[PDB]
Symmetry: D2
Amino acid sequence: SMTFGQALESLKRGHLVARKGWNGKGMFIFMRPEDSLPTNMIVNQVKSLPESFKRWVANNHGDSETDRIKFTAYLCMKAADGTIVNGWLASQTDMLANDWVIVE
Amino acid sequence: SMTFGQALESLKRGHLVARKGWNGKGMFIFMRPEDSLPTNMIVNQVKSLPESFKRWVANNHGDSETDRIKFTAYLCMKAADGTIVNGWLASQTDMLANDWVIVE
Amino acid sequence: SMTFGQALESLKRGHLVARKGWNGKGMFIFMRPEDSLPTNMIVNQVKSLPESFKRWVANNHGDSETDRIKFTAYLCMKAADGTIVNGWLASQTDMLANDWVIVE
Amino acid sequence: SMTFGQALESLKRGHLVARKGWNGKGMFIFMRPEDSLPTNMIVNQVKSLPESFKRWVANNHGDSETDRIKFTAYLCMKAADGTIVNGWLASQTDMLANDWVIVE
């Protein structure tokens, strides 16, 4: 019987959490921590990045092998259909509800 | 300072809150509590509702003098420009920050 | 078969829209247009406002009906339980889906 | 001058976009496309996942060399401070604005 604040503190400590009131079933959210990558890795190996973004990184860093780009922490959802949504966002109801529970 | 979870608990108790970086622009958020308005008002007196929604309420309730629509609680922003944005939403960074302050 | 962009242009024209892919059934979203209220009305008549906000309004504005607070347009949801959520949020999946439909 | 709908169609076609007022801070958003990855890579090689989520995956897929988990497309922000936010949020104002522009 947790508020979103308590759910967030559980997420920050690595738990999976959910709301009892969600329409879908089997769903949960989790936090992915901050990460920092060398820019040359961005430009040439990391995918799921659009060519325009890789070009922007290249044009701002070049061949550097010590320049870094930092990715903030963020929330994700294991959705009803089993897919993963990077970038879960909280509805008004989610933020203000007190029906949060720990899944793991 | 405060976590977003502590900010939400302050919001629920009726405070105005903000992240520290908002200070220069004078931005803050607040909670509007649940409210149930008679349907009559909704169909005939509320001006900030589209005609499609007012219809929908009548397709379902007709001339009911007794049926009410419930509006759940939600967050709002008093923006930099002085306008009010109903339906403030939290970014990943906002959700995970710990620089929230009570404004009032 | 509408994108979110098409759905938003319908929302701007006063229609109710929904996603086929949503888990909850019977739901839809709608736009509430910009509204300008006299500050007297905000301070003394609207119940769904916290006292701290009514004081902020009284302290930073006048009392004559020419004194107005502008509420920007925003999106809302008629939820599965019949409640209304002012301040609907678009998920990553909502924003990028092509399964939007006109509801009215 | 683009609606948010037009910005989204541009995003889906690999462009970097922004609202006109973002230009001073040099912020933009981009889309990362869908990707489908084998569960063993998720459990053992993907770097920013919490232990609890890796454990959930292992306890639903074993070592099956073929099982895959799909990550939906999503939006990201190159923020004012140069960090990358996976899972960018559109505000009410953002969704209804018509001051979107192509950055690249």
